[PDB]
């Protein structure tokens, strides 16, 4: 319907409330491709629509904002998604990206290695992940919750996402993790978002909006992934590139959201309310310092 003019489709709330069993994902338009604007890469279009959707949420956007982007490399050796994120984010936003393999980036700093090697002294206002291993997709085997980089991402959110911050983590039918869905219940709001340019794929971005640091709701992540697939199986999404032609309101507005360093005992219901509205970020405002662990081997 009018969804073709949106950047994509978010999982309707009624699907989130079901108790489905996990089935195979069988998309009506599987294999179809969207017609992209001349010379535009799929991953530029994909990240553009993701950012267009993120514009509709209550994201906290402080001064001195810091954003980290995992899985930012491509088989082309460049970082299209990072370039879109830097376009979208306010000028001056600190942007760090990372991937397993070497790539050329517009980020302020880039770490090359397994994401599990990545450590940061500071907390973050937004975490984006496009990490994906195509070897997880095996339609001949049972589809269990995956660990790997998802285990890292869950721990990283709980240790290094500022309260009030948000995440967008790429999943697919086979690339998913039950604890990550469970962690969506620790945000004021959450959804699974499918970009219109990639509507024929079981890909979605699992978005947690405004981190509360504790469960607002208990989510069974096995059931929730089954609910996500049930939604995808019963709701064909028409491939569409329409929203890419309307960039007039693309830039993320520098809201100037307040940043406060609060101790756990100080986070009352009024603070939680402010966090829930995108009106507050809780973290230190110190320097951004990152590192990657390097395993040292002498093969002589």
């Amino acid at each position: 319907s009018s969804q073709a003019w949106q950047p994509g489709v978010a999982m309707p709330n009624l699907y989130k409330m079901q108790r489905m069993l996990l089935e195979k994902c069988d998309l009506q338009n599987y294999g179809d491709s969207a017609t992209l604007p001349k010379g535009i890469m799929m991953n530029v279009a994909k990240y553009t629509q993701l950012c267009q959707y993120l514009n509709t949420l209550t994201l906290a956007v402080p001064y001195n904002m810091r954003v980290i982007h995992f899985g930012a490399g491509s088989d082309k050796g460049v970082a299209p998604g990072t370039a879109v994120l830097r376009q979208w984010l306010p000028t001056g936003t600190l942007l760090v990206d990372s991937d397993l393999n070497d790539f050329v980036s517009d980020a302020d700093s880039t770490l090359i290695g397994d994401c599990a090697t990545v450590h940061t002294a500071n907390k973050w206002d937004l975490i984006i992940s496009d990490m994906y291993d195509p070897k997880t997709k095996n339609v001949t085997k049972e589809n269990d919750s995956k660990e790997g980089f998802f285990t890292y991402i869950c721990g990283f959110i709980q240790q290094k996402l500022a309260l009030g911050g948000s995440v967008a983590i790429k999943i697919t039918e086979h690339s998913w993790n039950a604890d990550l869905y469970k962690l969506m219940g620790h945000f004021a709001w959450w959804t699974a978002f499918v970009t219109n340019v990639n509507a024929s794929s079981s890909e979605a971005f699992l978005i947690g909006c405004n981190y509360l640091g504790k469960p607002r709701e208990q989510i069974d992540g096995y059931v929730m992934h089954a609910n996500y697939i049930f939604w995808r199986n019963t709701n064909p999404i028409q491939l569409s590139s329409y929203s890419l032609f309307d960039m007039s309101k693309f830039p993320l507005k520098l809201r100037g959201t307040a940043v406060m360093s609060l101790k756990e005992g100080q986070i009352n219901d009024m603070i939680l309310s402010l966090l829930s509205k995108g009106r507050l970020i809780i973290r230190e405002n110190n320097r951004v310092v990152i590192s990657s662990d390097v395993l040292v081997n002498n093969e002589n």
Binding site: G39, V78, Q87, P251
Partner: protein
């Protein structure tokens, strides 16, 4: 007294018919921007395409040292505007052309300071 001359190699490669470096990252934008050469956000006008800067830098893309004595890059982390007529070779364009230090436009592709 030896250093690899990457700029000359790419120019010579182009002049002998080599295919331009590809996978420069083109951005979506309104194409109603200022048209300046290198900007903090896409600024293409109707005559230009905007690209992620690092992907259009010969030295970035070839994994080699920048000629800036401190190794600084003019393009990485910014957006470069390329005339649409030259967008088949953004790396060659940024290598061969120079930005006006007064108006910020490309010399010969926007800069009117000599009027």
């Amino acid at each position: 007294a030896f250093a690899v001359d990457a700029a000359k190699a790419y120019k010579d490669y182009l002049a002998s018919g080599g295919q331009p470096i590809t996978n420069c990252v083109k951005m979506l934008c309104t194409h109603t921007g200022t048209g300046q050469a290198i900007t903090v956000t896409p600024e293409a006008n109707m005559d230009q395409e905007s690209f992620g800067g690092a992907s259009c830098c010969l030295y970035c893309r070839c994994h080699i040292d920048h000629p800036n004595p401190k190794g600084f890059c003019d393009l990485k982390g910014k957006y470069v505007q390329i005339p649409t007529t030259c967008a088949n070779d953004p790396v060659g364009f940024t290598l061969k052309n120079t930005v006006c230090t007064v108006c910020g436009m490309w010399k010969g592709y926007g800069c009117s300071c000599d009027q």
